[PDB]
Enzyme design. Sequence first.
Site: not given
Lengths: 134, 127, 88, 95
Positions: D33, D41, D72
Amino acid sequence: DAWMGTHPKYLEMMELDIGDATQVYVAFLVYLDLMESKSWHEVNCVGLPELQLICLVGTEIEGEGLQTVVPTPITASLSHNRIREILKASRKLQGDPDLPMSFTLAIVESDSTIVYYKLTDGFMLPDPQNISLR
Amino acid sequence: PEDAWMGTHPKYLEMMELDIGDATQVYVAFLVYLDLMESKSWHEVNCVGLPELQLICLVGTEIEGEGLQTVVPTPITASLSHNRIREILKASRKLQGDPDLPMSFTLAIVESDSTIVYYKLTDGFML
Amino acid sequence: AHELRYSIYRDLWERGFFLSAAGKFGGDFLVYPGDPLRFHAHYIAQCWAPEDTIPLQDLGTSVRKTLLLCSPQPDGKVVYTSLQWASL
Amino acid sequence: PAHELRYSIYRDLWERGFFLSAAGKFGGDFLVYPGDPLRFHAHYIAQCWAPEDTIPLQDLVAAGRLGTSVRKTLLLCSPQPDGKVVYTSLQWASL
């Protein structure tokens, strides 16, 4: 039918003295498809003896530039190395080193039908940002 | 040194009476107790000894009626394996009373300067 | 390091995640949730030793997918060739 | 083996900025990808730990006070002698 055996373009490809009768026939098949079915402006056959390959170098539309078509029977096989070699040969024949190396592979099935595939050095997605369902 | 007065505190003495850990462990457990009750406004904080793990943890209700959380005070220099974390997760679920959430506890890391940083650890994939 | 990192990669791959484990991230690597709803334009890639002959019968392409041949060369460099259905 | 083959490719693709999915079938195709549509994202910052290895918390406190780890999720990953792998999410908590 056997009339192909004495067609001048067929005979000119054989005078390249590259490969056997099937490689000549396959290349003749694709030449007829480009010039008759797909209506290319001009198609020329070229031999490169070091790779033992008959190329068709053509102009699809009278204005645009050259592209390399490489006929091959479906039975044949290719290494990635060989594909790289054809890419580098195509770069010479097309005279376009400012563009990614590419050529069209013309695969002839046994029943003589021709499917075409464009091979390009590197990473070619027509739309790398595309988002669709599934 | 400057904190010898905390040895008098009844919740310090309660933690120490667990007979789990050295002075650094009891001390940082006590420091986290004070932080939860004063720097936050926690409802209740109870100490619990897990001698198998040789851990003191704090089990509390951050708000009255709300479910219990497990806080595991730890010096900055302690040794934590992932395996040890998994054992704390499993013990933490028993102390929380086997609810329905995935196993989690809060790790309360205490620096030599007594600053505390809180991290939530949860089984699996959260975000 | 290695056999141990790849046992995790394959598990994350099997669960459907995207992974990047570039050397930039040091020992860390990034893990992104898969999206079963949305198709993101991508390559369908193949690993090939440079000399192994690929059978031409063993050959699905459009604007959102491209076949990608990959081969590492003696000099540590890998070469990539994109393969696309031509519309002649 | 032909198994070093996949590593070299995977690493190069990573270094170039691509993301790999469905790449665990050593013998099959894998997916590659472009990074840019995906990188923004939500995701994990993941780490490989032998289960007995001690994870030094000093880095997790630097993260705490510099505000580096707030929004995070860190993903601890360890395979067991089972053959299985176990996963623990680690998130900064305000309290």
